[PDB]
Write a protein that binds this ligand. Structure first.
Ligand SMILES: [Mg+2]
Ligand SMILES: [Mg+2]
Ligand SMILES: [Mg+2]
Ligand SMILES: [Mg+2]
Ligand SMILES: [Mg+2]
Ligand SMILES: [Mg+2]
Ligand SMILES: [Mg+2]
Ligand SMILES: [Mg+2]
Ligand SMILES: [Mg+2]
Ligand SMILES: [Mg+2]
Ligand SMILES: [Mg+2]
Ligand SMILES: [Mg+2]
Ligand SMILES: [Mg+2]
Ligand SMILES: [Mg+2]
Ligand SMILES: [Mg+2]
Ligand SMILES: [Mg+2]
Ligand SMILES: [Mg+2]
Ligand SMILES: [Mg+2]
Ligand SMILES: [Mg+2]
Ligand SMILES: [Mg+2]
Ligand SMILES: [Mg+2]
Ligand SMILES: [Zn+2]
Ligand SMILES: [Zn+2]
Lengths: 81, 151, 102, 225, 25, 129, 63
RNA sequence: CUCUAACUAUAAAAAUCUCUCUUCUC
RNA sequence: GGUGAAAUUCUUGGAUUUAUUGAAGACUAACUACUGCGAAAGCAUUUGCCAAGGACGUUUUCAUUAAUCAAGAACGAAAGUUAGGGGAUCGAAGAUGAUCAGAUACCGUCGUAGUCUUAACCAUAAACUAUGCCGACUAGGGAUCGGGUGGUGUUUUUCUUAUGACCCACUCGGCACCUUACGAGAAAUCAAAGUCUUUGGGUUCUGGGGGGAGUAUGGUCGCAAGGCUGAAACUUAAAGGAAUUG
C-alpha cells in the first residue's frame, strides 16, 4: 500500500468493491430485454424486478420477485439492456 | 447508518447513477410517461408503487430523469396528490393495526413498547410536515381521528 | 483487576443464560460457566471385558457405550480435578489438552 | 443400617414351587415365534393364572426376534391378551430404541429434528409415533458445522408428519410392523427430504400404542397359525 | 463492614424507629 | 433355541446400597432380591464392589436353584435428578453375575434421564461441604 | 563434539553434487506438465519456454 | 505429499496470638 | 434413604425395590457453541393465528424531516406486598438429627409463604462489557451468523434442467476471535480504552481524599417492604488502583 490511484483504481478492484464504495457510486444492476414465447413483444424488465410482471398481451408472467434478482419463468429468452 | 429507533447500522439503499438525462437506449418520451403515471394515479395507487411499477413494467429509470420532474410534484400539478402524504398515512395504518392488536390481547408489553415508538415517529413526521405547512397547522392525531382517517 | 477478558463465562453478548445444576455439589451455575465433560465410557469396565466376552451368547457382542454429559460447578472442577489452576500466559490456550490418547 | 428397630405395626415356604411356567409366542409378523419363559403362580380358582396373565407387557429386543444383529438397537414390547395353555399368544404393544443407540447418533454440530404424530390407523388403533432426524455433513464440507435453518426444520417436520400420517392411516398395525422391520419408511422419508438436506440418521422412535378397538380375537388368531 | 449487611441492619433500625413513629403519632 | 430360559438382572447401583434384583423376561415376577446391604455390616460399604459382588453371587446361586441360566443384565443408576451416574458397585455386581456360570445377554442401560424436571435438592449454592 | 577426521568427512560429503542437475526437464517425462496459469504467465513474460497444459482440478478433497 | 477413538472413583474437626523497626555519601 | 462416617425417618399391615398403569402440577434436558433474537430485563417441545422488528436487494418513494437529551413518559430479573386459582418439586421460617466448648450454620429428614399462574402494586441488582449515544479515520489475519453477488465448481435427481445442499471468490451488517503496536495508557490491558500538551466531531450524566453515609432532616411515590431527591457538625493522613519481590 502507501501509494494508490484512488482516482484511477484497477477496473477489477472497482468490480469487486462494493457499490457506494467505488470512486463514484455505480449501480451493479441493469435492464433486460425479454422475449416471451407467447407473443413476439419484447419487454423491458429491471434486473432486480419486484412485481410479478406479466405480458401486456397475455397472462404469461415473466419474472418472479425474490430476495435477489427476479427469477425468470424458465421459458422466456433474455438479453442484457 | 443512524437507524432512528434501533441499534442497527446498515446501509441497504439505492444508488442512482451519475447520469441525469435519460439513457440513450430509452425509446420513450416524457409525454407518454406522464400520461401513464397519471393513469396509474386514477387507478388509485400511491406514488411509491407507481415508481416501482414504472421501473419494472417499463423502462422508466426515474421520473425526474426522463420527464424532468418528480412524481409527487407531477401529481400535485395534476392535483391527485393525497391530502395525507404517503409515509404518514402508512405510519397511521401501522399504528392503528398495532392498536387493534393491543386491544384484542393485552399483555403484549413489548408490542405496547413498539406502539410507543410508532407514535413517536408519527409525531416527528407530522411536526416536520406542519413546519413545511403541507398539513394544516391544527392537525393533531391522538387516538381515534385516524380510525376514520385510514378509511 | 480483570483476571480474564471473557470473565470466564463465554457469554459475551447473550443477555442471560439459563442455569444448569452442578453434577456433584448441585451448585446452580450458568450453562456457560458450567464446565463441561462428555464422559463416553463402556457400560462394562475395560478390566472385565474378558469375563463378559467368554460368558456371552451372540458372539462378539456390541457391548454398548454409555453416554452422559457432566456439569460441574467450578469449585468441584478444581477439587474433583477436571481442571487445574494454570500459570498466567497459559490461560490463553483454549485447545483440548494435547489429545490425551493418540 | 441393617439393624431394624424391630418395628412391626414363621410360615416360610419356597413360593416358586407353587409357581408354574409359561411360554411366550410372538405374532406371525416376526420370524422367531418363540420368545422365552414366564413364571406365574399355579392356576387356582379365585385368581386363576390366566386371570393374572391377561394384561402383561413384555419387552424384547428385535435382534432376537429377527435373528440378525442389525436390530440390536430396537426393542419391541408385546401385550398378553389370550392364553392357550402352557403357551400364550401376544400382540404388538409398543416399540422403542435402546438408550445406547438413541444417545449414539446425537452429537454436537448437528441440529436434530423430532417430528411426533398422533394418528388413527386403518381399523381403530390410535397411536403416537416419533421421528428423529439429523442433519448430515456433506462430503464436500470445509465448514466444520452442519446446522439447519428454522424454516428448513419446519419444512422437514411438515414432510415427515405428512408421510407418517399417510403410512399409518392406510394399513393395520400388523403390516405397519411388517414394513417397519426393514425401516422402509426411513428410506421414504430421506427420499422425500433429500432435496432439502442430506439429513442422515432418519429413524422412528417410541411407537406408542394408545387405543385398541375391542379385542378382535380373530386377528390375533390370524397372527398365530 | 459489609454493604449488604450493614444496609440490612440499618433497614432493621429504620423499621423499628418507624414503628416508634407510628406509636407516637 | 438352546433351552436357555432368559432372565433379567436389573442392576441398580446408586452411590449407596447397590441393588441386584433378578426378574423374569416379563419383568413382572421377581427372583432373588438380595442386595448389597444384606452382604455387608459396616454400612460404610453399602455400595462397595465387594458388597455388590456377594449380592450378585447369591442371586446367581438362587438363579441356579430356580433354573434361570441366561440373564438380561440391566444397569440402572440413580438417574433422574440425582447425579445420573453409575454407582461404584454395579460393575463388580455384573462381573460376578457373568462369572458365576450364568450366560449373559443384552446388557442395556435404562437409567431414567429427565427432560428438565424437578429442580433438585441442595438449594442454589448446593451442598456446601 | 567433532574432530579433524569428522570435519573432513563433513567437508567431502557436503561438496557432493550428483549428475545432470535433476532439473533441465530431463527427469519426469519431457517438459514439466504444469498449469495453464504459469503457462500464460510465461506467455505474458514474452518468452517461449516449452510447456504442457494440465488443469489442476480445483477440487480440494480432504486428503 | 496421507489419517478420525475410550476411560474412572477422595472433601472428619483445627479457635486464638503481644511488644520493636531502627542511615547512605565517593 | 442418607452421609467424611452415622442419626433423625419408613418398614413382615411388607416399605427400598420389578412391572404395568393413572394423577396433578413443574420444566423443556440431550441440540445448546466464545452461535441467534430483542431496548434492557430476558427468550429454548410442536402446530395454528396475531401483529411487530433487524439485516440484506433495489436505476422505488419525500427531501433535512437529523443526533443527544432537563421536564415528562413505556418496560424492567429475583426476592417482596394484596386479593382469587393451584399445591409436584425445591424450599427462608420453624421442627428436628449430627460435628463442635458453644453451632438455633454449613452435612442430614420433615417442613409453612414463594417457587406456577390471574388481576393490582413494588421499580430495586455486581440491571457488568463495572467501557453512554451518534459520527469519520487508522492494522494484518483467519474463521462464524443473516443477506446478496458471480461461478463452464462439486455432488446431488425426474431420463435432465430448477430448488436445496455444499466448495470457491467478493460484498453488507451482527455477536465475536487471534496477532502485533508503529499509538494509548500507571499499569493489568486496549484495535478501542487509539486518532489527547501537536491539548476542540455533536452531545447528555456523574466524581473532587477516606470515614460521617447514601445516614440525619424536609419533600416526593408506595398498603408496606422501602425507592428517588440528599446534607451538615465532627474525624483522620491517609483510604485506594496496578504491579514487584518475599
Ligand atoms: Mg482477586
Ligand atoms: Mg469457563
Ligand atoms: Mg438443609
Ligand atoms: Mg472446599
Ligand atoms: Mg412390594
Ligand atoms: Mg440458531
Ligand atoms: Mg443485539
Ligand atoms: Mg432442547
Ligand atoms: Mg429523566
Ligand atoms: Mg395467592
Ligand atoms: Mg444439633
Ligand atoms: Mg434451621
Ligand atoms: Mg425435602
Ligand atoms: Mg416471585
Ligand atoms: Mg443500585
Ligand atoms: Mg452502573
Ligand atoms: Mg450503560
Ligand atoms: Mg469525600
Ligand atoms: Mg463514599
Ligand atoms: Mg424521610
Ligand atoms: Mg493493591
Ligand atoms: Zn404476453
Ligand atoms: Zn459442584
Amino acid at each position: 500500500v502507501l501509494v494508490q490511484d484512488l482516482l484511477h483504481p484497477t477496473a477489477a478492484s472497482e468490480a469487486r468493491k462494493h457499490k457506494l464504495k467505488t470512486l463514484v457510486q455505480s449501480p451493479r444492476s441493469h435492464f433486460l430485454d425479454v422475449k416471451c414465447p407467447g407473443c413476439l413483444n419484447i419487454t423491458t424488465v429491471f434486473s432486480h424486478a419486484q412485481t410479478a410482471v406479466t405480458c401486456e398481451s397475455c397472462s404469461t408472467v415473466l419474472c418472479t420477485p425474490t430476495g435477489g434478482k427476479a427469477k425468470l419463468s424458465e421459458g422466456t429468452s433474455f438479453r442484457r439492456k | 447508518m443512524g437507524r432512528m429507533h434501533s441499534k442497527g447500522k446498515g446501509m441497504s439503499s439505492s444508488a442512482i447513477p451519475y447520469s441525469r438525462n435519460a439513457p440513450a437506449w430509452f425509446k420513450g418520451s416524457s409525454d407518454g410517461v406522464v400520461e401513464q403515471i397519471i393513469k396509474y394515479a386514477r387507478k388509485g395507487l400511491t406514488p411509491s408503487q407507481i415508481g416501482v411499477l414504472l421501473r419494472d413494467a417499463h423502462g422508466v429509470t426515474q421520473a425526474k430523469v426522463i420527464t424532468g420532474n418528480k412524481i409527487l410534484r407531477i401529481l400535485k400539478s395534476n392535483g391527485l396528490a393525497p391530502e395525507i402524504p404517503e409515509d404518514l398515512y402508512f405510519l397511521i395504518k401501522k399504528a392503528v393495526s398495532v392498536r387493534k392488536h393491543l386491544e384484542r390481547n393485552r399483555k403484549d408489553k413489548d408490542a405496547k413498547f413498539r406502539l410507543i415508538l410508532i407514535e413517536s415517529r408519527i409525531h416527528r413526521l407530522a411536526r416536520y410536515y406542519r413546519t413545511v405547512s403541507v398539513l394544516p397547522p391544527n392537525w393533531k392525531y391522538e387516538s381515534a381521528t385516524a380510525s376514520a382517517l385510514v378509511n | 483487576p480483570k483476571k480474564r477478558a471473557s470473565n470466564g463465562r463465554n457469554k459475551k453478548g447473550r443477555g442471560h443464560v439459563k442455569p444448569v445444576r452442578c453434577v456433584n455439589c448441585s451448585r446452580s451455575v450458568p450453562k456457560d460457566k458450567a464446565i463441561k465433560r462428555m464422559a463416553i465410557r463402556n457400560i462394562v469396565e475395560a478390566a472385565a471385558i474378558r469375563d463378559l466376552s467368554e460368558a456371552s451368547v451372540y458372539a462378539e457382542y456390541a457391548l454398548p457405550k454409555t453416554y452422559n454429559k457432566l456439569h460441574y460447578c467450578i469449585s468441584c472442577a478444581i477439587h474433583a480435578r477436571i481442571v487445574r489452576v494454570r500459570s498466567r500466559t497459559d490461560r490463553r490456550i483454549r485447545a483440548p489438552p494435547q489429545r490425551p490418547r493418540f | 443400617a441393617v439393624g431394624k428397630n424391630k418395628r412391626l405395626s414363621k410360615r416360610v415356604v419356597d413360593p416358586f414351587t407353587r409357581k408354574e411356567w409359561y411360554d411366550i409366542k410372538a405374532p406371525s409378523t416376526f420370524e422367531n415365534r418363540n420368545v422365552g419363559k414366564t413364571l406365574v403362580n399355579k392356576s387356582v380358582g379365585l385368581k386363576n393364572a390366566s386371570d393374572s396373565l391377561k394384561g402383561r407387557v413384555v419387552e424384547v429386543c428385535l435382534a432376537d426376534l429377527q435373528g440378525s444383529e442389525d436390530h440390536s438397537f430396537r426393542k419391541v414390547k408385546l401385550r398378553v391378551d389370550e392364553v392357550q395353555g402352557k403357551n400364550l399368544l401376544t400382540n404388538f404393544h409398543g416399540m422403542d430404541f435402546t438408550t445406547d443407540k438413541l444417545r449414539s447418533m446425537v452429537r454436537k454440530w448437528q441440529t436434530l429434528i423430532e417430528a411426533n404424530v398422533t394418528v388413527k390407523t386403518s381399523d381403530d388403533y390410535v397411536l403416537r409415533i416419533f421421528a428423529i432426524a439429523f442433519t448430515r455433513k456433506q462430503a464436500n464440507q470445509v465448514k466444520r458445522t452442519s446446522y439447519a435453518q428454522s424454516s428448513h426444520i419446519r419444512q422437514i417436520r411438515k414432510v415427515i408428519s405428512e408421510i407418517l400420517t399417510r403410512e399409518v392411516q392406510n394399513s393395520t398395525l400388523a403390516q405397519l410392523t411388517s414394513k417397519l422391520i426393514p425401516e422402509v419408511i426411513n428410506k421414504e422419508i430421506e427420499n422425500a427430504t433429500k432435496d432439502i438436506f442430506p439429513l442422515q440418521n432418519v429413524h422412528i422412535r417410541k411407537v406408542k400404542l394408545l387405543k385398541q378397538p375391542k379385542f378382535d380375537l380373530g386377528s390375533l388368531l390370524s397372527l398365530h397359525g | 463492614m459489609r454493604a449488604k449487611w450493614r444496609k440490612k441492619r440499618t433497614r432493621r433500625l429504620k423499621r423499628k424507629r418507624r414503628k416508634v413513629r407510628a406509636r407516637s403519632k | 433355541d438352546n433351552s436357555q430360559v432368559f432372565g433379567v438382572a436389573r442392576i441398580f447401583a446408586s452411590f449407596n446400597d447397590t441393588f441386584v434384583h433378578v426378574t423374569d423376561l416379563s419383568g413382572r415376577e421377581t427372583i432373588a432380591r438380595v442386595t448389597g446391604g444384606m452382604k455387608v455390616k459396616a454400612d460404610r460399604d453399602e455400595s462397595s464392589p465387594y458388597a455388590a459382588m456377594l449380592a450378585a453371587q447369591d442371586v446367581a446361586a438362587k438363579c441356579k436353584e430356580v433354573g434361570i441360566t441366561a440373564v438380561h443384565i440391566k444397569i440402572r443408576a440413580t438417574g433422574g435428578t440425582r447425579s445420573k451416574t453409575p454407582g461404584p458397585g454395579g460393575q463388580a455386581a455384573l462381573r460376578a453375575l457373568a462369572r458365576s456360570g450364568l450366560r449373559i445377554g443384552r446388557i442395556e442401560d435404562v437409567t431414567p434421564v429427565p427432560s428438565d424436571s424437578t429442580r433438585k435438592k441442595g438449594g442454589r449454592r448446593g451442598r456446601r461441604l | 563434539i567433532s574432530f579433524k577426521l569428522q570435519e573432513e568427512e563433513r567437508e567431502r560429503k557436503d561438496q557432493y553434487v550428483p549428475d545432470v542437475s535433476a532439473l533441465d526437464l530431463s527427469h519426469s517425462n519431457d517438459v514439466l506438465n504444469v498449469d495453464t496459469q504459469t503457462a500464460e504467465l510465461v506467455n505474458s513474460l514474452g518468452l517461449k519456454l516449452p510447456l504442457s497444459v494440465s488443469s489442476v482440478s480445483a477440487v480440494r478433497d480432504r486428503r
